[PDB]
Design an enzyme around this catalytic site. Structure first.
Site, PDB file in Angstrom:
ATOM      1  N   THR A  15       0.790  -1.246   0.000  1.00 51.24           N
ATOM      2  CA  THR A  15       0.000   0.000   0.000  1.00 51.24           C
ATOM      3  C   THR A  15       0.822   1.297   0.000  1.00 51.24           C
ATOM      4  OG1 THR A  15      -0.251   0.344   2.401  1.00 51.24           O
ATOM      5  CG2 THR A  15      -1.608  -1.382   1.389  1.00 51.24           C
ATOM      6  N   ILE A  18       7.929   0.782  -1.527  1.00 46.46           N
ATOM      7  CA  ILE A  18       8.342  -0.138  -2.565  1.00 46.46           C
ATOM      8  C   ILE A  18       7.167  -1.002  -3.022  1.00 46.46           C
ATOM      9  CG2 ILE A  18       9.626  -2.307  -2.791  1.00 46.46           C
ATOM     10  CD1 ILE A  18      10.839   1.254  -1.790  1.00 46.46           C
ATOM     11  N   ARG A  38      -1.474  -4.652   7.196  1.00 42.11           N
ATOM     12  CA  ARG A  38      -2.105  -5.070   8.421  1.00 42.11           C
ATOM     13  C   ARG A  38      -3.252  -4.097   8.781  1.00 42.11           C
ATOM     14  NH1 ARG A  38       0.905  -3.059  11.570  1.00 42.11           N
ATOM     15  NH2 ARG A  38      -0.096  -2.181  13.447  1.00 42.11           N
ATOM     16  N   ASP A  62      -2.005  -9.209   8.208  1.00 42.53           N
ATOM     17  CA  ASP A  62      -0.689  -9.103   8.824  1.00 42.53           C
ATOM     18  C   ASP A  62       0.088 -10.331   8.356  1.00 42.53           C
ATOM     19  OD1 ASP A  62       0.351  -8.281  12.158  1.00 42.53           O
ATOM     20  OD2 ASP A  62       1.443  -9.462  10.728  1.00 42.53           O
ATOM     21  N   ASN A  89       6.888  -8.786   0.515  1.00 41.44           N
ATOM     22  CA  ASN A  89       7.485  -7.492   0.717  1.00 41.44           C
ATOM     23  C   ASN A  89       7.295  -6.908   2.115  1.00 41.44           C
ATOM     24  OD1 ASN A  89       6.425  -4.331   0.307  1.00 41.44           O
ATOM     25  ND2 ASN A  89       8.539  -4.731  -0.408  1.00 41.44           N
ATOM     26  N   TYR A 155      17.039  -7.383  12.221  1.00 36.88           N
ATOM     27  CA  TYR A 155      16.753  -7.206  10.803  1.00 36.88           C
ATOM     28  C   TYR A 155      17.751  -8.016   9.952  1.00 36.88           C
ATOM     29  CZ  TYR A 155      15.176  -4.635   6.614  1.00 36.88           C
ATOM     30  OH  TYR A 155      14.651  -4.274   5.380  1.00 36.88           O
ATOM     31  N   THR A 192      11.313   7.180   0.289  1.00 35.46           N
ATOM     32  CA  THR A 192       9.875   7.057   0.387  1.00 35.46           C
ATOM     33  C   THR A 192       9.397   8.177   1.304  1.00 35.46           C
ATOM     34  OG1 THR A 192       9.981   5.759   2.392  1.00 35.46           O
ATOM     35  CG2 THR A 192      10.109   4.512   0.266  1.00 35.46           C
ATOM     36  N   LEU A 194       8.095   7.683   4.144  1.00 34.00           N
ATOM     37  CA  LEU A 194       8.579   7.346   5.483  1.00 34.00           C
ATOM     38  C   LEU A 194      10.013   7.777   5.745  1.00 34.00           C
ATOM     39  CD1 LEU A 194       6.975   3.902   6.128  1.00 34.00           C
ATOM     40  CD2 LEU A 194       6.360   6.074   7.243  1.00 34.00           C
ATOM     41  N   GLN A 251      31.471  -1.868  -2.420  1.00 38.50           N
ATOM     42  CA  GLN A 251      32.637  -1.390  -1.680  1.00 38.50           C
ATOM     43  C   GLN A 251      32.690  -1.983  -0.269  1.00 38.50           C
ATOM     44  OE1 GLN A 251      32.250   2.919  -1.635  1.00 38.50           O
ATOM     45  NE2 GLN A 251      30.605   2.863  -0.131  1.00 38.50           N
TER      46      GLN A 251
HETATM   47  N1  LIG Z   1      12.674   2.010   2.281  1.00 40.11           N
HETATM   48  C1  LIG Z   1      13.943   1.608   2.375  1.00 40.11           C
HETATM   49  O1  LIG Z   1      14.835   2.442   2.406  1.00 40.11           O
HETATM   50  C2  LIG Z   1      14.325   0.148   2.447  1.00 40.11           C
HETATM   51  C3  LIG Z   1      13.380  -0.886   2.428  1.00 40.11           C
HETATM   52  N2  LIG Z   1      13.769  -2.171   2.504  1.00 40.11           N
HETATM   53  C4  LIG Z   1      12.782  -3.265   2.478  1.00 40.11           C
HETATM   54  O2  LIG Z   1      11.826  -3.085   1.442  1.00 40.11           O
HETATM   55  C5  LIG Z   1      10.546  -3.616   1.754  1.00 40.11           C
HETATM   56  C6  LIG Z   1       9.427  -2.641   1.410  1.00 40.11           C
HETATM   57  O3  LIG Z   1       9.687  -1.316   1.861  1.00 40.11           O
HETATM   58  P1  LIG Z   1       8.603  -0.257   1.833  1.00 40.11           P
HETATM   59  O4  LIG Z   1       7.409  -0.750   1.044  1.00 40.11           O
HETATM   60  O5  LIG Z   1       9.165   1.010   1.264  1.00 40.11           O
HETATM   61  O6  LIG Z   1       8.159  -0.039   3.256  1.00 40.11           O
HETATM   62  P2  LIG Z   1       7.818   1.289   3.891  1.00 40.11           P
HETATM   63  O7  LIG Z   1       8.977   1.690   4.766  1.00 40.11           O
HETATM   64  O8  LIG Z   1       7.530   2.380   2.888  1.00 40.11           O
HETATM   65  O9  LIG Z   1       6.621   1.081   4.778  1.00 40.11           O
HETATM   66  C7  LIG Z   1       6.542  -0.086   5.584  1.00 40.11           C
HETATM   67  C8  LIG Z   1       5.739  -1.116   4.805  1.00 40.11           C
HETATM   68  O10 LIG Z   1       5.791  -2.411   5.385  1.00 40.11           O
HETATM   69  C9  LIG Z   1       4.545  -3.085   5.375  1.00 40.11           C
HETATM   70  N3  LIG Z   1       4.312  -3.830   6.634  1.00 40.11           N
HETATM   71  C10 LIG Z   1       4.948  -3.640   7.809  1.00 40.11           C
HETATM   72  N4  LIG Z   1       4.481  -4.504   8.745  1.00 40.11           N
HETATM   73  C11 LIG Z   1       3.539  -5.252   8.168  1.00 40.11           C
HETATM   74  C12 LIG Z   1       2.651  -6.351   8.589  1.00 40.11           C
HETATM   75  N5  LIG Z   1       2.721  -6.809   9.899  1.00 40.11           N
HETATM   76  N6  LIG Z   1       1.805  -6.872   7.688  1.00 40.11           N
HETATM   77  C13 LIG Z   1       1.744  -6.418   6.420  1.00 40.11           C
HETATM   78  N7  LIG Z   1       2.527  -5.414   5.973  1.00 40.11           N
HETATM   79  C14 LIG Z   1       3.420  -4.812   6.774  1.00 40.11           C
HETATM   80  C15 LIG Z   1       3.513  -1.982   5.184  1.00 40.11           C
HETATM   81  O11 LIG Z   1       2.585  -2.302   4.163  1.00 40.11           O
HETATM   82  C16 LIG Z   1       4.270  -0.745   4.761  1.00 40.11           C
HETATM   83  O12 LIG Z   1       3.901  -0.383   3.443  1.00 40.11           O
HETATM   84  C17 LIG Z   1      10.616  -3.969   3.234  1.00 40.11           C
HETATM   85  O13 LIG Z   1      10.578  -5.381   3.396  1.00 40.11           O
HETATM   86  C18 LIG Z   1      11.937  -3.418   3.743  1.00 40.11           C
HETATM   87  O14 LIG Z   1      12.480  -4.326   4.694  1.00 40.11           O
HETATM   88  C19 LIG Z   1      15.072  -2.498   2.589  1.00 40.11           C
HETATM   89  C20 LIG Z   1      16.055  -1.514   2.614  1.00 40.11           C
HETATM   90  C21 LIG Z   1      15.677  -0.183   2.542  1.00 40.11           C
HETATM   91  C1  LIG Z   2      17.611  -0.898   6.202  1.00 40.63           C
HETATM   92  C2  LIG Z   2      16.261  -0.184   6.221  1.00 40.63           C
HETATM   93  O1  LIG Z   2      15.206  -1.155   6.220  1.00 40.63           O
HETATM   94  C3  LIG Z   2      16.132   0.689   7.416  1.00 40.63           C
HETATM   95  C4  LIG Z   2      15.930   0.125   8.667  1.00 40.63           C
HETATM   96  C5  LIG Z   2      15.804   0.935   9.790  1.00 40.63           C
HETATM   97  C6  LIG Z   2      15.876   2.319   9.671  1.00 40.63           C
HETATM   98  C7  LIG Z   2      16.077   2.893   8.418  1.00 40.63           C
HETATM   99  C8  LIG Z   2      16.203   2.079   7.295  1.00 40.63           C
HETATM  100 MG   LIG Z   3      31.118  -3.049   2.133  1.00 42.05          MG
END
Ligand SMILES: NC(=O)C1=CN([C@@H]2O[C@H](COP(=O)(O)OP(=O)(O)OC[C@H]3O[C@@H](n4cnc5c(N)ncnc54)[C@H](O)[C@@H]3O)[C@@H](O)[C@H]2O)C=CC1
Ligand SMILES: C[C@@H](O)c1ccccc1
Ligand SMILES: [Mg+2]
Ligand SMILES: NC(=O)C1=CN([C@@H]2O[C@H](COP(=O)(O)OP(=O)(O)OC[C@H]3O[C@@H](n4cnc5c(N)ncnc54)[C@H](O)[C@@H]3O)[C@@H](O)[C@H]2O)C=CC1
Ligand SMILES: NC(=O)C1=CN([C@@H]2O[C@H](COP(=O)(O)OP(=O)(O)OC[C@H]3O[C@@H](n4cnc5c(N)ncnc54)[C@H](O)[C@@H]3O)[C@@H](O)[C@H]2O)C=CC1
Ligand SMILES: NC(=O)C1=CN([C@@H]2O[C@H](COP(=O)(O)OP(=O)(O)OC[C@H]3O[C@@H](n4cnc5c(N)ncnc54)[C@H](O)[C@@H]3O)[C@@H](O)[C@H]2O)C=CC1
Ligand SMILES: C[C@@H](O)c1ccccc1
Ligand SMILES: C[C@@H](O)c1ccccc1
Ligand SMILES: C[C@@H](O)c1ccccc1
Ligand SMILES: [Mg+2]
Lengths: 251, 251, 251, 251
Positions: A15, A18, A38, A62, A89, A155, A192, A194, A251
């Site tokens: 929603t 990513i 969720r 969830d 995701n 994580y 994003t 967030l 790197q």
């Molecule tokens: N935004 C970033 O900078 C980074 C994101 N990621 C990974 O990318 C993936 C997606 O990131 P975003 O969509 O941008 O997340 P987001 O940071 O924009 O927002 C959190 C997202 O996680 C989902 N979520 C959290 N808990 C949940 C639950 N219990 N049930 C269902 N959904 C749940 C929500 O739908 C929400 O859209 C994640 O798995 C995250 O670990 C990894 C590295 C960096």
């Molecule tokens: C690695 C990425 O998912 C992140 C985790 C905690 C705080 C900021 C960014």
């Molecule tokens: Mg490195």
């Protein structure tokens, strides 16, 4: 255009961020999509912003909820026909070192990031195998599945687990001729709403010692690799890791 | 359709196998393409089979030939305008263990597989940097850049070299804001007319202990990951390895 | 001789197999050792077979038992003085694909292999940091932390988790000057009395398509890399993976 | 004490830095050692500083010199009996990006770092195989065989090549029962007299964004992992990479 014609996809945490971009590009390429969160306030708004119900719908779930996973597949197949594609995701983060991670924090994060991905992958294989769908499971497994971060201990555990569990699943599906591929996607840092609300995070993330390109990515950067992996273009790719990180891990 | 609109690509060893499929899909997606081979009988036939001269041309070149690399870029820019994309695909193999590799075999293979890729990458950076092209260098670096094979010693050396040299180049280009990305593609075993002429090779390659999917790939499997990497869809991907191997390296 | 003079080590699952050999060599090199097992019949026999109580003792503990971990450190420090070295070796396996892993199996295996390693690592850092001990945490993280196996899905998840969580811990400890190193050891297949009781397993494990050396290892193969990692010889090694596998992962 | 009893080792570039410490610890552990350098002023001084001629001698040799490699093995076997152990340590660096690497620089660095290691490994296998020596070839393959550095392009190529060529050799030797193991060692940054003469390098190298431990290593850090790999303690380790880097590659 048309690169996902006929596909039916579930995207957890679809929603915002990513997940929402993955959903958007999937619909653009002809897939039908069920997104989850969720919550519901976020989820229902999200779907309509991408397309019409014949293209994309929302299901409240969830990913840590084992029984719900079954509800979710059933709702998707009733809306759109048999599911071909799953993007695991949904995920959360705890900003703690291993040293300082409470047990409650540990369990909560593993429930979403590890158990949730296990539940989805296990059910996806069972539901998708042996149907000629060109089925594809795409597990979001992070740059933090390759390298550690001192303040992301739980994580890191979850992302390393997803990375290698996905290889196991890929191999079993390949060996058994299931017509299911399993791969991981490893985003670097992505910008994003967030991230924008965390003062200093993008800048901190853009230093050359972190991301060599000197800036962070956008959600569509992850959407496009997911389109490739969901499509039949990637029919020989299984068990592998696809990194889109601005050079972070080079790197 | 249109995913490489405006792009101008050089593909070394582009007249057969993987290179030819890369060329075919690149033209389909709107790129202009110059293919090479050290021969000409193969190369001129190849281009016309893909498209018209306004889409694709042939330039005779051995990738180990340093001076020729300059001739090749000049011919490409005169046909199609400034080069945006380079696929260093030309390569050879020697079927020898390290133990039994002659020095002549060593030098010959490194000249094509390592020096050739260095020459192309170095020149590509110089020609492509700072032009707003969304430039992308795609180096073919094999499953044999991840794992050894007892009978591919020199080949393994060359592929490991390409794998890590490409990261160096990616980082420098990123840090200097050159608008050039550098990534590697790592095919597993792929079925081509040349493999078909090696009795038993495909079968040998399809055993589950080698390729878990139980069959080998097709040239288009490599073409499609190259389209992604050449396109601006992959603008945040640099310094990384993209494996399309049927599960070979997952076990 | 004397390579672990002064060290005080806890080895989980130290009464048989790899753990017992780790204990044996640690005592030989001058360390004091507390071994554990969830049972007692096995554990008390084990310690006396290695040495006298001033060298080695047994403490009954299931590594999944969070509260017990505290009991274990206290018992070790009262026997031998402050703990310098922790080997998180206890682990179990489930012979199931991801597809067929029951949730109970998943939770049970993660409790020992993942939660147990987290509990030990977290407590070890807290107990060992900032004492000038040359402290070292050695986490057993398998060849199955690098590659998948179609019939070890949960095991693969746990081993990938340990692999990367250990890097997080290593980094935090390094950055904070804690005088604690964290590394992983990745055995290939090793021959033990338990393997000997599984008909066909060693042979299956010795095929060249599995282990290139054509035979499996012995417990001391893992003991000796652990001596290196526990000793001050390895004072610059942290955050890394040490593989002793007969070539399994090299192909 | 005695961990290399009976062993006969060649160490290229053994007169200073890491090589000299490898030589020192090897002699301490009972090995006989032949060290090399392309010079002689350095080499003859070096050997006497470690031990007596019955323990350690010097042989003038440039590792890029193919014919000399044969002279070197012959001189070693005449001094000490059949060679059991080879450490391919000689190497050079060029401080250039790929973009700016001259062809002469490329060829010179590959001659030492890649061809030299190939020549040594190939000859070592031939000389050592099938003699019951517990033979071990240890190839120095750097953190720059895992990650790129924007200013070490040719060096990165050479180190990635050594990393994977070594796996090929390991596998062939294992499969053929040669009683020869081949592994790589990957130092992070290490403090030597040469580093001390480069103003700012150690400090630059000690920043937490480079080396998490906040300081660089010492030569003995590399010597001790080499003792393990040369000894029969590591008889099940082949085809793998041993990283001693202060956490550099863990982040
Ligand atoms: N935004 C970033 O900078 C980074 C994101 N990621 C990974 O990318 C993936 C997606 O990131 P975003 O969509 O941008 O997340 P987001 O940071 O924009 O927002 C959190 C997202 O996680 C989902 N979520 C959290 N808990 C949940 C639950 N219990 N049930 C269902 N959904 C749940 C929500 O739908 C929400 O859209 C994640 O798995 C995250 O670990 C990894 C590295 C960096
Ligand atoms: C690695 C990425 O998912 C992140 C985790 C905690 C705080 C900021 C960014
Ligand atoms: Mg490195
Ligand atoms: N076909 C396969 O099963 C596998 C191929 N690869 C890699 O994929 C890449 C492309 O493979 P294919 O196109 O299928 O090759 P191919 O096997 O079909 O034919 C050899 C190709 O290499 C090129 N080539 C060889 N020497 C050259 C030189 N001196 N100058 C210019 N070009 C030269 C030729 O154009 C020719 O098309 C190669 O780099 C190879 O190393 C890697 C693993 C498996
Ligand atoms: N034996 C082999 O072939 C291989 C072993 N490994 C790993 O090596 C490590 C040690 O292996 P072995 O000592 O040979 O094991 P083992 O197979 O000989 O016996 C099982 C051991 O695990 C310990 N254990 C199991 N559950 C436990 C619990 N709840 N609490 C405390 N201890 C528990 C027991 O002490 C027992 O000694 C394990 O973590 C295993 O995952 C990895 C690959 C192969
Ligand atoms: N010192 C450091 O910070 C780092 C060193 N390394 C690697 O460690 C290895 C050993 O380093 P050091 O002994 O400290 O080197 P060093 O920097 O102290 O001195 C250079 C050494 O290389 C040898 N050498 C150079 N060209 C040679 C030739 N043509 N023939 C024979 N020998 C030659 C010389 O014997 C000399 O001792 C090298 O392969 C290097 O690539 C890798 C990362 C960091
Ligand atoms: C790995 C692939 O390039 C190959 C090399 C030699 C013979 C067959 C196939
Ligand atoms: C990988 C090793 O721990 C194993 C697991 C299950 C059965 C046999 C061996
Ligand atoms: C990576 C190490 O070998 C190095 C190379 C050039 C200059 C300083 C250090
Ligand atoms: Mg393998």
């Amino acid at each position: 255009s048309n690169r996902l014609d006929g596909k039916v996809a579930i995207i957890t945490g679809g929603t915002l961020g990513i997940g929402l971009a993955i959903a958007t590009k999937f619909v653009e390429e002809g897939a039908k999509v069920m997104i989850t969160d969720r919550h519901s306030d976020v989820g229902e708004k999200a779907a309509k912003s991408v397309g019409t119900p014949d293209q994309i719908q929302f299901f409240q779930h969830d990913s840590s909820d084992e029984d719900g996973w079954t509800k979710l597949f059933d709702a998707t197949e009733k809306a759109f026909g048999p599911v071909s594609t799953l993007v695991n995701n949904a995920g959360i983060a705890v900003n703690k070192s291993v040293e300082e991670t409470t047990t409650a924090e540990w369990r909560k994060l593993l429930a979403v990031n590890l158990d949730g991905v296990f539940f989805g992958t296990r059910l996806g294989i069972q539901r998708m195998k042996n149907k000629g769908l060109g089925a594809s499971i795409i597990n979001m497994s992070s740059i933090e599945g390759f390298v550690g971060d001192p303040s992301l201990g739980a994580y890191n555990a979850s992302k390393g687990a997803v990375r290698i569990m996905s290889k196991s699943a890929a191999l079993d599906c390949a060996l058994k001729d299931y017509d299911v591929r399993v791969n991981t996607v490893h985003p670097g840092y992505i910008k994003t709403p967030l991230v924008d609300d965390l003062p200093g995070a993008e800048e901190a993330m853009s230093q050359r010692t972190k991301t060599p390109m000197g800036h962070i990515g956008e959600p569509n950067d992850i959407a496009y690799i997911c389109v490739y992996l969901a499509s039949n273009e990637s029919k020989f790719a299984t068990g592998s890791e696809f990194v889109v990180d601005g050079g972070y891990t080079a790197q």
